[PDB]
Design a protein around this ligand. Sequence first.
Ligand SMILES: Nc1ncnc2c1ncn2[C@@H]1O[C@H](COP(=O)(O)OP(=O)(O)OC[C@H]2O[C@H](O)[C@H](O)[C@@H]2O)[C@@H](O)[C@H]1O
Ligand SMILES: Nc1ncnc2c1ncn2[C@@H]1O[C@H](COP(=O)(O)OP(=O)(O)OC[C@H]2O[C@H](O)[C@H](O)[C@@H]2O)[C@@H](O)[C@H]1O
Lengths: 102, 398, 394
Amino acid sequence: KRELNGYVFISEDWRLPALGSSAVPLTSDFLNIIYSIDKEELPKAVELGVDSRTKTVKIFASVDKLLSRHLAVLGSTGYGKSNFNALLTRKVSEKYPNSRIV
Amino acid sequence: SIYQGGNKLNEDDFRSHVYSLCQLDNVGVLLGAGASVGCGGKTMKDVWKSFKQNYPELLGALIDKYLLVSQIDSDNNLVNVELLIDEATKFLSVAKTRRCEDEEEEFRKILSSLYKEVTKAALLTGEQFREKNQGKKDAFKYHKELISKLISNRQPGQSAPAIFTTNYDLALEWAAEDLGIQLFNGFSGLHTRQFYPQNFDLAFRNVNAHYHAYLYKLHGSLTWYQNDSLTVNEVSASQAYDEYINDIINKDDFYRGQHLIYPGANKYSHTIGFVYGEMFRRFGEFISKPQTALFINGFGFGDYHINRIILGALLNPSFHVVIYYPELKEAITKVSKGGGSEAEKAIVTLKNMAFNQVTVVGGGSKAYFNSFVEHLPYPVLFPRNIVDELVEAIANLS
Amino acid sequence: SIYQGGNKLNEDDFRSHVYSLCQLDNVGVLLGAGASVGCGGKTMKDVWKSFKQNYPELLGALIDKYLLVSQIDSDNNLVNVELLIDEATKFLSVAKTRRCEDEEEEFRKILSSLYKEVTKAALLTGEQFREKNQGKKDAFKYHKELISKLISNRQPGQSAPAIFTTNYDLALEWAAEDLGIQLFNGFSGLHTRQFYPQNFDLAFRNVNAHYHAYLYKLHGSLTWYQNDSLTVNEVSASQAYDEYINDIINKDDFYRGQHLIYPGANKYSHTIGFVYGEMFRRFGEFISKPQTALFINGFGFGDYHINRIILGALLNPSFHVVIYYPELKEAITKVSKGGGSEAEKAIVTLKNMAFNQVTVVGGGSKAYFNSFVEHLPYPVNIVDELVEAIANLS
Ligand SMILES: Nc1ncnc2c1ncn2[C@@H]1O[C@H](COP(=O)(O)OP(=O)(O)OC[C@H]2O[C@H](O)[C@H](O)[C@@H]2O)[C@@H](O)[C@H]1O
Ligand SMILES: Nc1ncnc2c1ncn2[C@@H]1O[C@H](COP(=O)(O)OP(=O)(O)OC[C@H]2O[C@H](O)[C@H](O)[C@@H]2O)[C@@H](O)[C@H]1O
């Protein structure tokens, strides 16, 4: 939907498109808009990666859901398990040196 | 601030209601003299103030001798100027026919002063009124938005939007010419432009595998005149300025007879009243169709016939209206004490009466023309520059 | 190496992008004088620098008395030969009309040397120019491959490929005859060949059950001339060489007048300018159609009109262009100080603008013709044994 001067995202699984609606391919701008977060917590995020299909969209993640709860990583041997831990620890240290990691 | 059926309403529901009204078969708007204030215009109160300030000796002849204006209305600045002009253009004709020299001579000065005062307030640009590309400025930024909004909400196979107005300035033509949109106003030809009432029933089509709208002027325009031919001609701004507007603005005494068509002055000739009659008849014919929605903005509700026509059209069960009124609170307060004027009484009667077809919006600064354009919806897939860079690069390319 | 709006690309993505753009409805390529050096051609500035040193006496008159050449450009070898010839032709006509014997005899000498210079490098084979089956030589191995790749990539029931060029040689026509296809250059006839503009609206078919392409020359050719009949004609290579080429090259002084049509001279007459106007109009009409793809290589971007028509055609959001420029590094260095020639500004400006359909290549030497023909998609010699059978019986 369109706002006064920007856009926001709200999802409820009860509204459906009407019949006869035209179909169009999606540009990278709409892809950027879809993953956008609330304007209140924009500068409190950490970069994660870029999709492989278009290679032109940036994926962020707010610190709140980044570290409030617990987490677990699953995968095969050497497929971004220790590398991801080291990279995430380095990034959270760089964003906030006050953090403690053991 | 937003009432319908006698109950308040919030912003989101009102915005959702406005969008649903734009999908009907027929859509039309009605504008008044207030819609051009932000572009450099003036309302009727300012015009009367300026007239009674600059020409104080002529008020006596109007008030005490010929009984054309009442003292109470003159004090409060609530005088119908166009009715006064229409009634004054009759004494002059009677005196001319009856061969009374002094009466003929006085009304020339009176009408010259009235026209000099009323003409200067409608140029909107001053001396640059005779230039070109006047629609590229920034004062006309919202008229283009309104025109683009109304056109892009129509699905193929539907009718075209219609616009009515009581102004006699060139704001809408200037705005529409820049966008690349053709307006039909019942005139055709270039070297000799004439009025054909049947032109209101035409539309374009393509043969090579376009976009238009309609404009009705209920009070005339500055570029319409009749010159000893028993017919009505239309000219461009440059020709009018070089012919008679410059003489009107910058001369002491200069008046001619049945020559100008605005703001509805020479109604005693059967040749001129035809245009007004047709323009007003098409308005009444329009709002009698099923599935019609009308917006009102800038209208002062000071007219009897328009009020009567609007009230009668509500008997049909498929006619919806939305009204804007900046001074709702003062009208409500004044009427509840047993006083008030005709416009306030009419608007309060409309507000109190229980209908889901009537919405009244009043908030002071929230009921202006700039805010009205914002409520209409942007299509999501509407694109939004590079053209300026390309034009600059081409221009700088030697 | 590869830039598009400010980002880099690799070989595979560039190949995929090229293959995607080679599927639209209309595809056309524009070639310049730079693509002919790979088979024996010469650059225009090479011609100028070889001309001024060969005739130092004439160079003084062109700069001192008639003010036709700017000394700075002569030092920097930035003189346009086509404009020079076009402007020099009308001086002789004016002198002849006003009967000035001195000016006429002076001007009759410069044009002979200029034409000897320009026609020397256009033969591409030397004396053997008047022989048969010149397209079988090694230098034309790439042109046949390019033509075959362009034709074979068109889907059935689609428009024919379009080829544009600026060089006035026969290099691109030699390969067509040996390959075995038909090119419509606007002419028709054998014993008396004439010019018919409507020829560009024909196509072959089989009555009982395909090879045709359109070529435009914006500056003429060596086989076109007007033989005083106020009509245009075309001849063969041998006939042209026997008629006028041999005399021009060998004889020291041989000039006749407004008789040859190359490289764009004699535009003042109302009979010769018809061909140039028609070719330019057809070029302009082509890039105004929807679903078009354009490829540019070997062009110096020195023609103001072509640049203007290219820039103005980008307002259509379904228009694609691919451009090669081996000298982008010196351009970006020069523009950093806000200085340079008009071509420098034209080539640089087309990068700092916001549009994702504009492609610029500045890989120094990555933008050469043999690599450009290589980039085209290709599918993933049976008569080689009958030669012995022919040699058996002779
Ligand atoms: N920026 C604004 N935006 C909207 N409304 C405004 C604005 N500024 C003032 N207003 C209000 O807009 C209104 C303007 O009132 P007037 O111009 O006298 O009324 P009319 O244009 O109908 O007068 C001509 C009539 O004469 C014939 O008889 C026909 O009836 C004609 O319509 C006031 O409420 C202003 O406060
Ligand atoms: N072997 C090569 N392969 C590919 N491109 C090449 C090669 N050699 C040079 N180039 C490029 O070829 C280009 C030649 O640069 P300029 O010296 O301006 O060309 P010109 O003097 O012949 O005239 C150029 C045009 O101007 C006229 O109006 C006509 O239209 C001419 O066609 C450069 O990009 C070179 O890098």
